[PDB]
Amino acid sequence: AHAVSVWEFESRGKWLPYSPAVSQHLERAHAKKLTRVMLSDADPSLEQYYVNVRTMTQESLTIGVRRMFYAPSSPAGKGTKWEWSGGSADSNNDWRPYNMHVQSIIEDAWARGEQTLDLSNTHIGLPYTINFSNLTQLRQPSGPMRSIRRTQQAPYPLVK
């Protein structure tokens, strides 16, 4: 009887998740039937990110935005996320979320004990292989290998 609401934006043909706090801010505005939202209101570093809820777009330009529902059992619903690292090897400063669906598939393969998950099968156009024994993402064919991680996160907004 419940779902969590994950707001997403378009980034290179990937529908990436906004953070829990930003999704929580967007959801409250949708609930109040508002049209315009400034994302800095929920995350002060999102400088002049303007989301129009009627056209379902974000300007900061061309970008699409959507509101998606996921189950309580998804990573979004359970308070956990899978991210990959953005710039040197054992660098921890620039982390990035995978598409929420991909996070669920990674979580599911991790939980079932897979040694490896080839994201190019599943879905896509994500030529990456995840290795759970060393927690990395390998750009096919043979790298870069970037660190991935599973961390606790706040709950996304709950819905009827």
Q: Do residues 14 and 51 both lie within one domain? A: yes
Q: Report the structure determination method.
A: X-ray
| Parent domain of 58 | 7-67
Q: Which two tokens stand for residue 102?
A: 């991909």
3-state secondary structure the chain: CCEEEEEEEEECCEEEECCHHHHHHHHHHHHCCCCEEEHHHCCCCCCCCEEECCCCEEECCCCEEEEEEECCCCHHHHCEEEEEECCCCCCCCCEEECCHHHHHHHHHHHHCCCCEEEHHHHCCCCCEEEECCCCEEEECCCCCEEEEEEEECCCCCEEC
What angle is formed at CA 107 by the lines to CA 20 and CA 114, rounded to 5 degrees?
Answer: 165
Q: Do residues 52 and 25 both lie within one domain? A: yes
Q: Do residues 84 and 61 both lie within one domain? A: no
Q: Do residues 108 and 82 both lie within one domain? A: yes
Asked if the peptide bond before residue 141 counts as cis, ω within 30 degrees of 0, the response is: yes
CATH number at residue 133: 3.30.720.50
- Which stretches of 60-144 are assigned E, i.e. beta strand? 65-70, 80-85, 95-97, 116-118, 128-131, 136-139
In the DSSP assignment, the letter for residue 74 is S
Cited resolution, angstroms? 2.2
